[PDB]
Design a protein around this ligand. Structure first.
Ligand SMILES: OC[C@@H](Nc1ncnc2[nH]ccc12)C1CCC1
Ligand SMILES: [Cl-]
Length: 167
């Protein structure tokens, strides 16, 4: 039993809700919140910009030190950093950005990072400003993640479409 509330159950391990991931994280304080990161951990917009704003830029400060030490992530890769005031940990995961010409096949690799964590609050990878089809992303999530994932879909209209089309 966990403290997530109001989710629709899609499969044994995947759950979905129309919600602002920032507000969800502040309420639940999950062990792991997933950020929709880029390889430079530059948290400008979308989920990343919103999460970073909610940390008063502490996420960005920590991320800049991480990059200065380690260099950029790989597309499809991840790193674990602090969750600041939002969660215990933040798993920064880089899905492919279609608006950069990146290979959508890397979306499965990106979701594989979730399997290293028993429970996660997460967005749909590569959706929104990353330019991929959210229906496809949800399908890849369900077919790749085996741990317990609670998906927050910000757009109510998109949420309704994902549920009604879910196979
Ligand atoms: O990953 C892409 C998704 N982005 C977010 N998901 C959840 N909460 C969010 N808050 C700010 C952006 C954001 C889009 C699909 C509908 C939104
Ligand atoms: Cl977005």
């Amino acid at each position: 039993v966990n403290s997530f509330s109001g989710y629709l159950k899609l499969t044994d391990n995947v759950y979905i809700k129309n919600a602002d991931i920032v507000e969800e994280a502040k309420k639940v304080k999950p062990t792991v919140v997933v950020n929709a990161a880029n390889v430079y951990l530059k948290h400008g917009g979308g989920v990343a910009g919103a999460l970073n704003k909610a940390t008063n830029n502490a996420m960005q400060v920590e991320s800049d030190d991480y990059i200065a030490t380690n260099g950029p992530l790989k597309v499809g890769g991840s790193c674990v950093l602090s969750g600041h005031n939002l969660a215990k940990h933040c798993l920064h995961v880089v899905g492919p950005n279609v608006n950069k010409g990146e290979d959508i096949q890397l979306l499965k690799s990106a979701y594989e990072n979730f399997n290293q964590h028993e429970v996660l609050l997460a967005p749909l990878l590569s959706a929104g400003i990353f330019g991929a089809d959210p229906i496809h992303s949800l399908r890849v999530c369900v077919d790749t993640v085996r741990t317990n994932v609670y998906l927050a879909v910000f757009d109510k209209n998109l949420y309704d479409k994902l549920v009604s089309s879910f196979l």
